[PDB]
């Protein structure tokens, strides 16, 4: 049990340095040792992989290793990601050692003949390394071919494959850190937001708030993250299409009064010109009449627990800004009218 | 409704006048559909001066409510509309002299002196003479 610690950390070291370009001394001995360690790990995954305290202990070791590294400063190393990556750790190492250019000639020959012995062992009960790589290559091709022949960017982002997928990747990674309780998820998410492409990220979170629960801790963390950071939520609410954020609301009543707040204040910072009978903004970045109309359009074609909310938030802002009954005058009169 | 005292329904009616001046054309004599007013109602004069009229009429109700930025918007538009009224420039310049006089005011002074009644219909001529202030030239030479 404690025997497994020194084994797994040593293999984790070797796995991280797998990618690294120091390889002159390495040999058949290193390679054979690596693959037999990986078989041992893959064998444990099979033997006592479920319903054990050793299971949870190894995940403590994983997460605390993966947070002392962070993804910051010395190496943004992926690492073996979870206990299920135990089942194909061999594969990680092997793929990465192909990618290692510095791999010396005779070691590479012994390597490739140890990975690819041939059809001499065509008969195996155990899914050997050759068959494992097979199924990978096949799938990889498989995904290229579907993407480029019959894939379509679904409008309804919630039901897209890729958005659905990236959402569920994120939620695994959040559930781990939630249970670990080492750092707050807030920190993790804030750092993500700063590091990677924001346009993608937002859309995903969006899609993640909508997937039903799988083990709603995930959604319940991200809403508190978002209410915590208004400034990202100002670009969130601005960047997406309308129906997405509308069904976001009927799910999480906690986002409704703030979102209507955002536009309520976006409405008031226009001005109507009589030459073109249209509201317009002063600066380049001020939301159009059509995008604002759009968003309130969607919120009205929704469930009754949001209809009354949006209706009354507009009536109370109409009365506030003179209860006129004509255009030219109140952005809010314009809306109420435009709905019939 | 101004004489009666009703700010609300006043600004209503000025806005409704303005909407049918811009979000319609009076000169659609594409189809001779009837018997119709040749003269009094088509004159480009009657358009630009009727715009100015309702824009100032509404600007005064904005001044009454204390929304002098909106009043400035309507007065600034009427200046672009009919630059040969001077009732327009008068109201605009009095508002600038209330708030932020110098550069704006002088820029419009030099315009007036650069600038320096053909067939206006009667109810409109009469309406302008009604609303215009006596202390007009006095203010414009200051
Ligand atoms: Zn006529």
UniProtKB/Swiss-Prot annotation, chain A:
Subunit structure: Belongs to the multisubunit FA complex composed of FANCA, FANCB, FANCC, FANCE, FANCF, FANCG, FANCL/PHF9 and FANCM. The complex is not found in FA patients. In complex with FANCA, FANCG and FANCL, but not with FANCC, nor FANCE, interacts with HES1; this interaction may be essential for the stability and nuclear localization of FA core complex proteins.
Keywords noted in UniProt: DNA damage, DNA repair, Fanconi anemia, Nucleus
The UniProt record lists the keyword Glycosyltransferase: no
Effect of residue 236 to R: Reduced monoubiquitination of FANCD2
Localization annotation: Nucleus
Function summary: DNA repair protein that may operate in a postreplication repair or a cell cycle checkpoint function. May be implicated in interstrand DNA cross-link repair and in the maintenance of normal chromosome stability.
Organism listed in the record: Homo sapiens (Human)
Effect of residue 324 to A: Strongly reduced monoubiquitination of FANCD2
One GO term (biological process): interstrand cross-link repair
GO CC annotation: chromatin; cytosol; Fanconi anaemia nuclear complex; nucleoplasm
Name of the protein this chain belongs to: Fanconi anemia group F protein
Disease: Fanconi anemia complementation group F: A disorder affecting all bone marrow elements and resulting in anemia, leukopenia and thrombopenia. It is associated with cardiac, renal and limb malformations, dermal pigmentary changes, and a predisposition to the development of malignancies. At the cellular level it is associated with hypersensitivity to DNA-damaging agents, chromosomal instability (increased chromosome breakage) and defective DNA repair.
Pfam families: FANCF
From Swiss-Prot, chain B:
Subcellular localization, as worded in the UniProt entry: Nucleus; Cytoplasm
Coiled coil: none
Tissue: Highly expressed in testis and thymus. Found in lymphoblasts.
TPR repeat ranges per the UniProt record: 1-24, 52-85
Complex formation: Belongs to the multisubunit FA complex composed of FANCA, FANCB, FANCC, FANCE, FANCF, FANCG, FANCL/PHF9 and FANCM. The complex is not found in FA patients. In complex with FANCF, FANCA and FANCL, but not with FANCC, nor FANCE, interacts with HES1; this interaction may be essential for the stability and nuclear localization of FA core complex proteins. The complex with FANCC and FANCG may also include EIF2AK2 and HSP70.
Involvement in disease: Fanconi anemia complementation group G: A disorder affecting all bone marrow elements and resulting in anemia, leukopenia and thrombopenia. It is associated with cardiac, renal and limb malformations, dermal pigmentary changes, and a predisposition to the development of malignancies. At the cellular level it is associated with hypersensitivity to DNA-damaging agents, chromosomal instability (increased chromosome breakage) and defective DNA repair.
Protein task: DNA repair protein that may operate in a postreplication repair or a cell cycle checkpoint function. May be implicated in interstrand DNA cross-link repair and in the maintenance of normal chromosome stability. Candidate tumor suppressor gene.
Protein's name according to its UniProt entry: Fanconi anemia group G protein
Organism: Homo sapiens (Human)
């Amino acid at each position: 049990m404690e025997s497994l610690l020194q084994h797994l950390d040593r293999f984790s070291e070797l796995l991280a340095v797998s990618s690294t370009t120091y390889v002159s001394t390495w040999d058949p001995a290193t390679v054979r040792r690596a693959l037999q360690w990986a078989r041992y790990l893959r064998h444990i995954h099979r033997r006592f992989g479920r319903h054990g305290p050793i299971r949870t202990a190894l995940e403590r070791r994983l997460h605390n290793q993966w947070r002392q590294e962070g993804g910051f400063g010395r190496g943004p190393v992926p690492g073996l990601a979870n206990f299920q990556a135990l089942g194909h750790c061999d594969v990680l190492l092997s793929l990465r050692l192909l990618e290692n250019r510095a791999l010396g000639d005779a070691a590479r020959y012994h390597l490739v003949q140890q990975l690819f012995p041939g059809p001499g062992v065509r008969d195996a009960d155990e899914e050997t390394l050759q068959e494992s790589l097979a199924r990978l290559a096949r799938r990889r091709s498989a995904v290229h071919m579907l993407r480029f022949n019959g894939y379509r960017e679904n409008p309804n982002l919630q039901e897209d494959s890729l958005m659905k997928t990236q959402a569920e990747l994120l939620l695994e990674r959040l559930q781990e850190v939630g249970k670990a309780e080492a750092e707050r998820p807030a920190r993790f998410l804030s750092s993500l937001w700063e590091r990677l492409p924001q346009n993608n990220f937002l859309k995903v979170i969006a899609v993640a708030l909508l997937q039903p629960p799988l083990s709603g801790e995930g959604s319940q963390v991200l809403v508190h993250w978002l209410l915590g950071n208004s400034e990202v939520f100002a670009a969130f609410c601005r960047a997406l299409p309308a129906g997405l954020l509308t069904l976001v609301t009927s799910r999480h009543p906690a986002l409704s009064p703030v979102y209507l707040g955002l536009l309520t204040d976006w409405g008031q910072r226009l001005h109507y010109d009589l030459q073109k009978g249209i509201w317009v903004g002063t600066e380049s970045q001020d939301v159009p009449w059509e995008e604002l109309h759009n968003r309130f359009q969607s919120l009205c074609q929704a469930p009754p627990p949001l209809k009354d909310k949006v209706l009354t938030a507009l009536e109370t802002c109409k009365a506030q800004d003179g209860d006129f009954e004509v255009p030219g005058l109140s952005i809010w009169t314009d809306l109420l009218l435009a709905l019939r | 409704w101004v004489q009666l005292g009703a700010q609300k329904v006043a600004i209503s009616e000025f806005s409704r006048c303005l909407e049918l001046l811009f979000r319609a054309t009076p000169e659609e004599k594409e189809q001779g559909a009837a018997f119709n007013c040749e003269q009094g109602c088509k004159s480009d004069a009657a358009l630009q001066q009727l715009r100015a009229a309702a824009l100032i009429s509404r600007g005064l109700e904005w001044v009454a409510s204390g929304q002098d930025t909106k009043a400035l918007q309507d007065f600034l538009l009427s200046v672009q509309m009919c630059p040969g009224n001077r009732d327009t420039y008068f109201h605009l310049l009095q508002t600038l002299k209330r708030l932020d006089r110098r550069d704006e005011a002088t820029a419009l002074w030099w315009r007036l002196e650069a600038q320096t009644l053909w067939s206006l219909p009667l109810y409109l001529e009469s309406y302008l003479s009604w609303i215009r202030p006596s202390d007009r030239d006095a203010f414009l030479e200051e």
